[PDB]
Write a protein that binds this ligand. Sequence first.
Ligand SMILES: [Mg+2]
Ligand code: NA
Ligand code: NA
Length: 323
Amino acid sequence: ETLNGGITDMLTELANFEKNVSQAIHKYNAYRKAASVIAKYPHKIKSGAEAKKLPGVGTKIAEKIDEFLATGKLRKLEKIRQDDTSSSINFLTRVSGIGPSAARKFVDEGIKTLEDLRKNEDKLNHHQRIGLKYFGDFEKRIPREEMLQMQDIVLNEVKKVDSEYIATVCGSFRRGAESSGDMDVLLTHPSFTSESQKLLHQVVEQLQKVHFITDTLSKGETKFMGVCQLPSKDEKEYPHRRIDIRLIPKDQYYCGVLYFTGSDIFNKNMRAHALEKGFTINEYTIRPLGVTGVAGEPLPVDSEKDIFDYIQWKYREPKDRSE
DNA sequence: CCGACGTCGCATCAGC
DNA sequence: GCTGATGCGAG
DNA sequence: GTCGG
Ligand SMILES: [Mg+2]
Ligand code: NA
Ligand code: NA
């Protein structure tokens, strides 16, 4: 932090404005990359030129850093921050299911605040209402102790519906993280393959029957997004939580797990490495690239380890897949 | 100079 | 009613 | 906005 935190906040703020106000998702990711890279740099950045050396920090961000160091502020940001229209739009997107477009329409027609949304239930789609209901809870983090508690429930109820199911809670949770943002469960069964009833439904149903799943954002044959909660002790109720459960075919499961285990940077590397070794990994399958680039049949995979074999890597533990 | 920067499931909107 | 686009939130 | 063909 305090080393170059002034700078990473500036860049993260600018990132958020590009995403929500300007609708420039690529400039959003540029500032985000620039932020991460400076955040890892263990020296108090002395000038914009110094920063430029780092990947993802270019001319225009070197300039902003120079201005910030010299003045301790950045004129464009100070100005956007006082902007009534924009700071509202930026804010409203914090409601889950409200993106840059819905937040634009809203601010356009007066609606700017949480109370403004609360007064206009009838202009919110279903996702948005749930988002408003749980705005506070959703911006909280999930402590790993609750994550374990949550998992206990998920693994118990999945098994109770049919013992042949496999459920794996992935995400940063799986990489040993102290806290999580939501839960992502990857679910498969022997009767579901690429060449292959209600398998997702029955599990949601049962998580609902024991009152773990409280609300549904969206649900189809393969992906469920919704809300969940741990039950009460006399002690204060637990916050409501985002949970995603996805149903993957068995032959694509361990690719699924690898992929949704991450981290984003770790997959970015593992794809680059598997490349030269003559393989293409995606979230679904690993395939061999033939002489000119033509990817052939997907190789069978029966554990995460199989993938690591194909590309001559030693199976790295989820605990060490930070990059 | 100029295009990639993942792509996808699902809910909901637009067009027909 | 149907089909395709667009919005959203996820690596 | 940054990078790179
Ligand atoms: Mg049985
Ligand atoms: Na640079
Ligand atoms: Na949102």
